[PDB]
Design a protein around this ligand. Structure first.
Ligand SMILES: *[C@@H]1O[C@H](CO)[C@@H](O)[C@H](O)[C@H]1NC(C)=O
Ligand SMILES: *[C@@H]1O[C@H](CO)[C@@H](O)[C@H](O)[C@H]1NC(C)=O
Ligand SMILES: CC(=O)OCC[N+](C)(C)C
Ligand SMILES: [Ca+2]
Lengths: 55, 135, 159, 68
């Protein structure tokens, strides 16, 4: 993991959603296909909707 | 002509011209790229998707000392057209594009002068994200 | 087949596709441009675009691709990939949501006197101002602007 | 197999087989191509846009004397 938090320096505010949290988690698991352990990084984007429009 | 093809082969000869190398004379020297956007048309502004589609001509000019020649040795030719895919290009792109297309849409020829000046004017249909104000 | 193999070996022995095909610099490559419409796919009034399916009929003279058919078992004409020869870079100026230049690149007919005939298909989504004053009885006037993109009049001229 | 690889290399050897040339023989003759469309499924017929989508197998048979 270069950095736990996902970089947002050049983010372009969509105007509909706001990123509450975005952290990549390093997971390792095995698949029934193959006999080796495969590592991965999963980024969980927690986005909160702005309700004014749909309200 | 024979002279023109001889010149073109001489300029783009891969043994003496590598398009992956910046045409920088000195280590601290940097290439200056002039830019100018010619708005040929404003195709549309989608407020729902917050995208503006424009048809622009992106004039780009810079100096490539490796593409110089003496006109007197080449039948007094002052400028030749070289394909833009076979010369070093400053990869200028629309950074805030809203559809994942960064480059230009045609990649036309580049008009090269005998002193190394490149003049490239490719067209492009750009889709840039916009902040639409609805108040 | 061997005759055509020999002809192809000869023609592209020292051909340079990046150079304008004029024996003399002062000459003009005369390109006989012309369209043949296949179907008017759509006229998007809301978006002010016109989709068409046309064949672009370009014809020009190349002075390097010449031969005498007597030597090559009377091979007057051959079909060669269009990517191996110099072609005019005609583009659609008033493009909108499409491609500026032909992208299909069919095979170009080549004759024994240097002539070349290239007729690739293309779907052009040009822009055209729509007048809906008398809708649905309206009559539209949508235009396509074709021209060479980098060779001025002194070098390439459209006929 | 070694023999099969040798045959494939021999047939497509670019020095003797140019795919850009019609396999015309006996002079200014034409190559006869046999077509046969096998309809595998009629995926859909859209009436609004007037387009039929078909899944077909386009059989094509000709004779190339250079691949003997
Ligand atoms: C090219 O054309 C110019 C103008 O007609 C003429 O003066 C010149 O001699 C020509 N050169 C050749 C090589 O034909
Ligand atoms: C169609 O438009 C062209 C260019 O805008 C114009 O020259 C021509 O007269 C128009 N035709 C009609 C019938 O209005
Ligand atoms: C030199 C060159 O690329 O010119 C492009 C613009 N145009 C089509 C108006 C001449
Ligand atoms: Ca319509």
């Amino acid at each position: 993991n270069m950095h736990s938090r996902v970089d947002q320096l050049d983010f372009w505010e969509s105007g509909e959603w706001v990123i509450v949290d975005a952290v990549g988690t390093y997971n390792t698991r095995k698949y029934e296909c193959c006999a080796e352990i495969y590592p991965d990084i999963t980024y969980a984007f927690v986005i909160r909707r702005l309700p004014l429009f749909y309200t | 002509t024979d002279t023109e093809e001889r010149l073109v082969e001489h300029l783009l000869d891969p043994s003496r011209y590598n398009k992956l190398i910046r045409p920088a004379t000195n280590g601290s020297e940097l290439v200056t790229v002039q830019l100018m956007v010619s708005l040929a048309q404003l195709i549309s502004v989608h407020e729902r998707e917050q995208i503006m589609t424009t048809n622009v001509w992106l004039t780009q000019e810079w100096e490539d000392y490796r593409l110089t020649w003496k006109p007197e040795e080449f039948d007094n030719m002052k400028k030749v057209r070289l394909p833009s895919k076979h010369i070093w290009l400053p990869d200028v792109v629309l950074y805030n594009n809203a559809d994942g297309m960064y480059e230009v849409s045609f990649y036309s020829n580049a008009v090269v002068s005998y002193d190394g000046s490149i003049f490239w004017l490719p067209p492009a249909i750009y889709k840039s994200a916009c902040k639409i104000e609805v108040k | 087949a061997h005759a055509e193999e020999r002809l192809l070996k000869k023609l592209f022995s020292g051909y340079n596709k990046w150079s304008r095909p004029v024996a003399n610099i002062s000459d003009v490559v005369l390109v006989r441009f012309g369209l043949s419409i296949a179907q008017l796919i759509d006229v998007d009034e809301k978006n002010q675009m016109m989709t068409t399916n046309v064949w672009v009929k370009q014809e020009w003279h190349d002075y390097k691709l010449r031969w005498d058919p007597a030597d090559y078992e009377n091979v007057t004409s051959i079909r060669i990939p269009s990517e191996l020869i110099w072609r005019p870079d005609i583009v659609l100026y008033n493009n909108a949501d499409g491609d500026f230049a032909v992208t299909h690149l069919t095979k170009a007919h080549l004759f024994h006197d240097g002539r070349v005939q290239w007729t690739p298909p293309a779907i052009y989504k040009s822009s055209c101002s729509i007048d809906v004053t008398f809708f649905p009885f309206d009559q539209q006037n949508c235009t396509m602007k074709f021209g060479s993109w980098t060779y001025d009049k002194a070098k390439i001229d459209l006929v």
